[PDB]
């Protein structure tokens, strides 16, 4: 049921983590491209290191959750001309579709 | 074990945020989706049932803001997301 929805094999994990991590780097670069003060730079380096260190999907889960719509619809946070509210609605839609595909 | 009062407060704040964010809406599909999410929030029991909604509405809860009245860009909201999940492990 739930398990069946969130099922995968070990051979899927490396490639999935790899392409998802590539996209998360693209997004992160977009947001922190013009990192000018040392605080911005240390933040960018933190998140780069944390992406680099990740090996399994649950290591990336938080980034996937935050940047779900950007990943799914191939959008960049600096170019996507949508209100915050529109983005949270897209988030809700991803969540609803997850539960729907699950209950199917 | 998570405290009942804390779970209940957080759930109520999430439902307030949801109601506000879907004040715009009166297209039939949007209405049914809001009904779904309100019911899912209402039904929840432990923090785990909420954890997706807290992830999405993180900055709203953290600053106690309303998404309809918060004057920020989507990029600034995602930067705030980045900062909360950075400070989480630390």
B22, B55, B74 member nearest A84 (Cβ): B74
Of B88, B61, B87, B60, the closest CA to residue B76 belongs to: B60
User: What is the DSSP code string of B68-79?
Assistant: TT----HHHHHH
Sequence-distant (6+) residues with CB within 8 A of B1 are none
Residue numbers in B near A96 (CB within 8 A): 33, 36-37
Note the residue count of chain B: 90
- Resolution of the experimental model in angstroms, please? 3.0
Sequence-distant (6+) residues with CB within 8 A of B67 are A84, A85, A88, B17, B20, B21, B57, B60
CB A17 within 8 A of CB A56: yes
Of A78, A88, A82, A68, the closest CA to residue A24 belongs to: A68
CA B90 to chain centre: 22
Way it was determined? X-ray
Longest dimension (CA), chain B: 43
Residue numbers in A near B67 (CB within 8 A): 84-85, 88
Which tokens is A86 given?
């529109």
CA-angle at B51, arms to B63 and B75, nearest 5°: 45
Of B35, B78, B7, the closest CA to residue A92 belongs to: B35
CB B85 within 8 A of CB A62: yes
- The full set of domain ranges for chain A reads 7-103
B36, B67, B85 member nearest A88 (Cβ): B67
CA distance, residue B22 to nearest chain A CA (Å): 8
Report the interhelical angle of A38-53 vs A12-31 (nearest 10°).
170
CB B50 within 8 A of CB B58: no
Per-residue burial over A36-67, b if 16 or more Cβ lie within 10 Å, else e, is eeeeeeebbeebeebbeebeeeeebebbbbbb
Q: What is the CA radius of gyration of chain B?
A: 14
Distance CA B20, CA B14 (A): 10
Q: Which helix (H) or strand (E) holds A62?
A: helix A57-66
């Amino acid at each position: 049921l739930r398990l069946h929805y969130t099922d995968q094999e070990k051979l899927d994990v490396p490639s999935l983590v790899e392409i998802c991590k590539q996209q998360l780097i693209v997004i992160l670069k977009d947001m922190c491209s013009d990192c000018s003060t040392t605080d911005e730079k240390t933040s960018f380096l933190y998140h780069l290191n944390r992406l680099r260190s990740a090996v399994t999907v649950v290591d990336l889960h938080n980034y996937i959750a935050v940047f779900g719509p950007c990943l799914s619809y191939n959008k960049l946070p600096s170019t996507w001309n949508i209100s915050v509210c529109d983005y949270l609605k897209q988030q809700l839609n991803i969540l609803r579709a997850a539960d729907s595909q699950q209950n199917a």
